[model samples]
Target chain A: MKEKKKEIEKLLARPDLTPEQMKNYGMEYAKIEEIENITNRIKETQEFIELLREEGENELEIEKYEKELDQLYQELLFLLSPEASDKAIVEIRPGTGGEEAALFARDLFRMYTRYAERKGWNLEVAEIHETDLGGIREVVFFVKGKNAYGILKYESGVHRVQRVPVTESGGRIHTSTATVAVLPEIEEKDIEIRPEDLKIETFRASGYVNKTESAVRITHLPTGIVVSCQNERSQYQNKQTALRILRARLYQLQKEQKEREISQRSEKIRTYNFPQNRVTDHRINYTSYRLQEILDGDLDEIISKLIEHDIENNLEEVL
Target chain B: MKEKKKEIEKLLARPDLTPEQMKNYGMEYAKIEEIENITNRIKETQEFIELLREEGENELEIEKYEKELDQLYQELLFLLSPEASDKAIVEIRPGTGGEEAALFARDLFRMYTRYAERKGWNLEVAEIHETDLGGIREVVFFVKGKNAYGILKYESGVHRVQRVPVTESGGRIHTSTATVAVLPEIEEKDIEIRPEDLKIETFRASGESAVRITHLPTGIVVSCQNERSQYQNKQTALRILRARLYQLQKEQKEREISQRSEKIRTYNFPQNRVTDHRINYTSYRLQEILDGDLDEIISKLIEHDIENNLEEVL
Candidate 1:
């Protein structure tokens, strides 16, 4: 910590520091300060507990002090990790049950959008392909807020929905599936794209103002990965947004390619049952009966459980 | 000048100076140093020219010193003004000759694009509407690099083209007019747009991206239909509106006379001459100019503007 502070001081004394450098150093300095504060609190809390024990103090006070200490330790561990609470780029797409699957994807998009709004998170729909019946064939959006990615990362898997479809006249419940992929929003600073490696093409889109709506398609030469973004109004913006999505996709691809293995997480992560009013996370065997509430952006309980489960299992240890 | 140098030293000594403050100070310091250097050079060159005249030496050296001194004075005038190098957003539309006008607009767009390419400036076609006859009805593009707007601002106004039309059966010459509007590409940092004053509308364009932005205060409405993403469309629309609003503000403040409709230049093919109506300057290299050798024309225009001391407006 002292060394970090000294390094920051050294950087601060430089006469030619750029804005980006200052911001990065400032963030690290702030993080180190926070860690120090947490450490001090933990020490103070322990000393207080010892004092209480010596004085034969109330058990409730000790319990409260211990809880606060534990929380501080957990937060300290989080701060110690080489991690960033970046915005989440989420993509939800229909997988099965045709039109019902499309509707389920739309429902998931709405649920996540509402969740972000409830959390005071900014939401931007990067791209969306909708059906005639108000169903989303596919949707990609950004959920930006504190810990938005960390909270939503657990959602990247198949989400099954059991409900009576609006298109179904038979009044029978059917199982529909939608796949969610939550990736961190990678900034230009995190990834570098060589201009020479990208082949860019733009064409006018067809819609209300077909003559003016432009979309960009970019192909990476080395990876042969193609990415297209069409919902932007200008060619330059479409190019930029497409590159952003491509960066995220390329980052995710690199992780798997380097490891040559898939994530250990289950393929089917959660199931929402409308008939039984239940929502269940398969991995942790966690269930919540408030299905409507869960669909309405009340994801705190489920996320809390998942976080607790991960912490207890030491599955996501920071250090 | 010494005070400015001292101020920079003090700023450099500060441990907590922000990047913005440092950059601003650094730029001013560099500018001041440049001015001092130029002033010294002008003084020394004048002395050298006087020495040459006293010795009755080579006339070539005296002429060169005078030319250099004159250029230095012009550059000093430029530095004295609060100026910025900004990108240029050029809009070209067909005016009066039907299909010929559209074709002329296309030619003008190509000429500018080629010129930008040759100058190593980044060019992006913001919007373009093409006719079936391979003519541009209207086109908007951005030319970005150092002094892009400053160089292209002279190109704004009506451009007349006299040529034997490709569609002409009788082989008679026809006159076509294409109007060019060159506006500086305004950055978000230079302008503050109130969110409340904007009414944004998005609809599925032909390729699923379209946005319409209406500035309520100015009633300036702009739509971008060429981008595939609605968000991108909105961004482009906002950029266009910002440039327009900035131009409007400048117009109101400067109380500038109308230059948009004035016949600025005429390209005469048979006569093999291109004339700037404003400056009464004629260039016989019409083919070369059309093929994108614009440095001569642009340089002459800049010289004229500088001679008139219009760098203050810049």
Candidate 2:
């Protein structure tokens, strides 16, 4: 019992590891630590039982420990699954009405960013596209931490916003939408994509008003995968950026095909209706119109529901 | 007219100048050439008109030349707006349904990649966060070309996908979604973020997973107006990013507040059951859902309607 507890204590002590490293290696460590904790608790309870047997202890106390240990054991088992540690990526794209849609996309981005900040998850902007109205045409970013995929992965789909435009002189509401594409950012080493199977291309750069030219494009040959960048200076830098994006895209393609072939099923997570100020997660079959609170990072309700759904799904598979 | 034609000929004879360079420093050269062409045609028609004035020749040819010249002038005016040349950034992020949502995101990435390729726009990935299951958490890339922003700026919003999951055992249908965020990748000098206004934290490098990221505890405060290096640049970029996002939230808040104040107003935009707030109209067609076409609804109720209401308030 003492040995098992010591193992878990040692594993939890290593908090200096980066999120990426932790994702790859720390998962296994966490599982082992959980297992050790469960086993130690069980052993301690069993010893208590023996002690009760010897000293004639209360039945109520024994029942309590037994129930507690049993619950802990189940939780430990649940924590061992790789899916339990999965994180989410929320994508918001502008749709329909020109600047209004772009503006709506910008709002969705902030909502998710605030949600991540509140959850203590690290948020990183993977990529962003902007409009002339200072709105987001499309913005891509990642939130990294524990159960990121689990928490935010269900936020994918079309988000429709109802509102008016800053430039509008006529009293009328505008409907604009941004498509959200939430994906899980996985470790590079976990997926292997060869570099030789790619076709790279560079094109003439375009500058806006007073800016100089800076744009690049890269294509992956085997899968007809293409990636481009014009956001940075120096063609070389853009090319590097394109290559990295291509890698991620190609990796995602391969994963999708694998999933399709293996599972042969489709899953729709949820939809956010901006007009109603509600977020509907399909898996949980719950709707919360507290859009302000949800965007402000009070996502515990949604996340907890999602976790429960995942647990249920896991259990169903086992049964 | 003869002299203008001769001048245009002289300008065209110079082969060393590029098209863009000629457009900049030789506007007179192009103008002279256009004027010469128009004048020559006009002269030919005028000769015909003179012949008619002399006796039974038709004046229709002169009228035709005038019409063509007017059309040409309008075309030239259209080409003068340089704001149409700006480029835009496109951001793609994964939204709902776990890995399935990520897969849908992957679908969107491909759609944009294909669309960009078709348009001959230069596409690049500025940054990316990938999932283990071959899904993207978020992908930031750009399409650069003439009028890239003008063309693709409308593709930002929530994209819904209705399909079966790759992991379903009972063949049950599961709906998942992914959000796409697009923005314009502006020049460095345009928007500047100061240094002291940011809170930067650096984590220790922990091997391959943490490469390029250092453990030296080096950090910079992005005061919302700096673009010197990648670090400073990103900080400034984040400020603009934050502003746009905040603006979005504010707009949403206003809508929600208004909806609450007005009892008759219904907040239903993209649902299967259609309801009109102003006229109290309700319809079940949802034909748009089956056809995957919501342009009419988006334009009529969401876009134009909202704009009209806001303008009334203003």
Candidate 3:
């Protein structure tokens, strides 16, 4: 917690606050105080839990304490990152394994959309590449609402699916993977790409997109990476859509690096057993056996745990 | 098994074969037909394994039949998609987990290079972006030699790693993932790309020769920096631009959509089993799969694809 002198001295000399800035600061301060208040309470409760165990208190009372602590930890998620009103762009790609990965990627894409709908957040599929087999190769999307980035960022790691593949006539559970990369939607004005830096290759349209040569493969000469977008009717629309994704990826690459390196390791953060009824998140060692409900976008239990873990990390950062 | 009628037809009315082509054709025919013969033997043995089980033969007797099939499967890998003289470019990225995922990505990256070294193939790290934590965010590179793309491509998709991470203080096993995308390297010509489709972003000189060019369409920009002159740099970049654009064009031209989802294998360190999901094959020696000894398993996957593609299609 910030000492009173430090907080006042810093704020007094703080950049002459605009009404907006002052309001923001005031809210931030209140939240910080609330967090500090809870932290002490939780610490005391932890000691109490241990003390009760030492004294061999009623097991039911100890269980009640643990649940109370969990709820308190969940509250700290508000301070994780990003403001409550932030919007975010999420990138989902099916990696490794074949069509199964694509299908799993689709599952996650929908899960997010469903979650967004439930939150009354306006979600948009900014870009997508679909396969005829009811699978999505890739989906780049946007979700705007309160705590979009803060809540969604926990899902950026790899999600592994373990279940009998729809095509598995042998009834064998096939394990496949899909990766998510989330970025707070930084606007175009924040980042600039020299138009000259883009090498656009227009090809005769093969898919339903353009009636006359509208598919574009844009090469970033500086980075030498390419992006292709042919989903929209106009090649221009396609190029810009792909460009939007490019800008976000570039932003994520640089900005995410600046933030506490939230290990963007291409590692499995969670595993799901669809056949059996369980989902386990390795980061927090939390599990939800309510498989069907979880898939249907009832993510409160999982999200709280993620927030709780993330909050603890932030507390350490603050301290 | 190199049949008379088919060989005669190929030689008599083919795509205007040169003398060298004739020799290669003859050689390829022998190997392909030999593969057909073995494929038959394999199918027979597959049937034979079933028959032995039907006749109630002991498990040891069944083992001999499986080993025989494995050797035949090994032969087909040499004839897998990319020719022996072909070289490949492999892109590796840490995909889903955190720091541990990055570590596994590095592990697979080095694993392939080590495997390439054992095969006497030349391997080079074309590019890499390092992380503060001992890991690479991503790496793109080239490998030159026979069976390059054929075997390397099997490593495509997400590589699953399950083990106690180096940083896990609690001793809990963590599962992570990495993805590899393999491409066969194309030489100086063949696919023409418009030079205008390039956007070179940075330049701070210092490096060597052999003006390596980059093709733009697919956007995999591996440019050669060692040219003594500026003209060579642009030209080198243009050449490889053709390479990737051609690759993209080729990919765009054929095989769109649908069918079975085959996630080739999983590295389950927690269970001490490395499984090749395609053939329902598993080896108890997990280290063998995780190390340079990857060839044996790759061959089985190669043969599985090769037989389905078979000779007449070629």
Candidate 4:
């Protein structure tokens, strides 16, 4: 028992409990305490049961302890949700559909906006592109928090919505595509850029944010990727913004191009059957009867495969 | 510069580097270093570019550093997809489609098996039911390790799959469903079961190693036939029994609980990638969680419940 106490003490003594794992350390306590707590409760209840027998045994108390023990066992079983407590950026694009697709694009945006408001996540539109009907365009939703990229990484992919079109008078069901990409900001240190390759335009109270003149548009001459930002933090280099959008475009794009009946190997099919209000990402492979939203918040499921898929190829090549 | 060095020293001194975050901590170094590694090259290349400008700067060196840096960043982003280091049980059930769903169930199992084999974790089939086409009815996988359930908790829920079917004349896409629930092992004292509740029979060494149990009060029958010995088999039967019994019982306790009555649900993507339907949530890499390449999602769900249980009224 002293050894066990020492073990916990030693574990708690570790200085490296970065915010994410520190929670695990805390759960580590509950897991141990509740595990001990319930076991003792069980023994106590068993004693009560012994006195009362089956017909009147403390079934309620037994049930209570059992539920708690399961919960604690579950707590001790997995480490804390690692990345959910960290931060990352998210991008949403209208894939392949015109006006109808744009409608779904806004729907998907409102969906995550509702999410940030709902989950109490710190959200900001790093670079938001909206059109009256350019529902045809793309949107970049940036999430910054402990679990930013950790939780939303699954959203970086193409989403297809099938519903009766705003254009259809015959009650025609149409299919439109939209994309949600969770882009973990590449720290300035992460991406290498020659001071010369960038074209930076600085203005005060000029571009996107008149109050701060924080918006900057940058273009990489070689890649033709234009980056724009209104926030002062990423700095005025519209170049990085262009590169992020450009890089983000290439992130899920490049592969799965040409509307060749996209399935498998990175093309996630999230069928939004409006008639049923059901949305299912075919990648998970089950057609959910109704999905208020299909995994933009949980989009890492698709993106990580591509991400790991992306890295696995590289690891194979390099190592 | 002295402060920066001290900062590095302080970071190195941290003791909580447990497996998962250490990999991250180490990468935080590489990520900064590699980010540094390549940036200086870019700086040098920029200096070269300034000397002759972009035309004279050795583009190849910059390009080389660039690729390595990106690869390094990808490497450092998520750590060694650490195993949560614990022990628990995994169950896979076919959810929606008929035979197709069963086929995917087997595929999911095979995938996890390959991951377990690759990750050097001890994996045993507590109970696996396979159909003829190699499609399976369900599999209950028991994994024993330091951080077992922490890593696997996300792999619970319905797995959806879409593939051109054998029945398809043109390229008919048939969607199927399979379910996986990773239930952590419940300790004996907590369940408070009477010795009379269990009917244990020691079979001959001749018979197949399996223990089947029937509940007298509820008339619910459950069994474990996968282990080599009758005792191990009986033990597993009780484990699954205890986990699921809470659900059947709790439905009465909390009416809303019936919506998901069970815990630890997961969803599987078509090619790679699995989500935790175990709890509505949301990486690591694709293979990290499911691959043991190996374990990824579900901890989010577990944490949520933990948040409810500990941080809440429980």
Q: Which has the greatest TM-score?
A: 1
Candidate 2 TM-score on chain B: 0.46
CAPRI-style grade of the A/B interface in model 1: incorrect
* Model 4: per-residue Cα lDDT over B1-314, one tens digit each: 12363377457748765777667667556544653454355346445534443565544555444334333322322222232336777888887789988987887898788766754679877777778877889788788764556555656666676666555666757777788777666666756555445544432223334356655554555665542333234556777777666545655678666463343333334354444454554432445544444323333443344335432232
Query: Local error of candidate 4 at A302, Å?
Result: 11
Candidate 3 ranges with C-alpha deviation above 4 Å: A2-28, A36-75, A80-85, A208-214, A255-266, A314-318, B1-314
How do the residues A47-157 of candidate 2 rate in per-residue lDDT, one tens digit apiece? Answer: 877677658555556756644654554454455445634444456776666766776676667667776776578886656776654467777665777666645655676
Count residue pairs with overlapping backbones in model 3: 28
Displacement of residue A293 (Cα, Å) in model 3 is: 1.5
- RMSD from true fold, candidate 3: 25.4
List, residue by residue over A84-197, the lDDT tens digit for candidate 1.
765878999998889899999998998898888887889988889898889999888878776678778889999999988887886999998999999998988998777667
- Write one digit per residue (lDDT tens) for candidate 3, span A95-142: 777999999898888888777887678887776888778998988887
Which candidate model has the greater TM-score, 1 or 4? 1
- Of the two candidates 1 and 3, the one with more favorable DockQ, higher being better, is 1
Classified by CAPRI criteria, candidate 4 counts as incorrect
Q: Order the candidates by TM-score, highest first — what do you get? A: 1, 3, 2, 4
What is the C-alpha lDDT profile of model 3 across B1-314, one tens digit per residue? 34664567466447686887777667766665766777788789888788777675556577677667766665555644345435777778886787667766766765686678777888766555555443557776778776677667777776777776533322677877788887766666555556576556435554344334433445566555442455655554454455566666776777464212344567776676777776887777676555566766776776657656664345
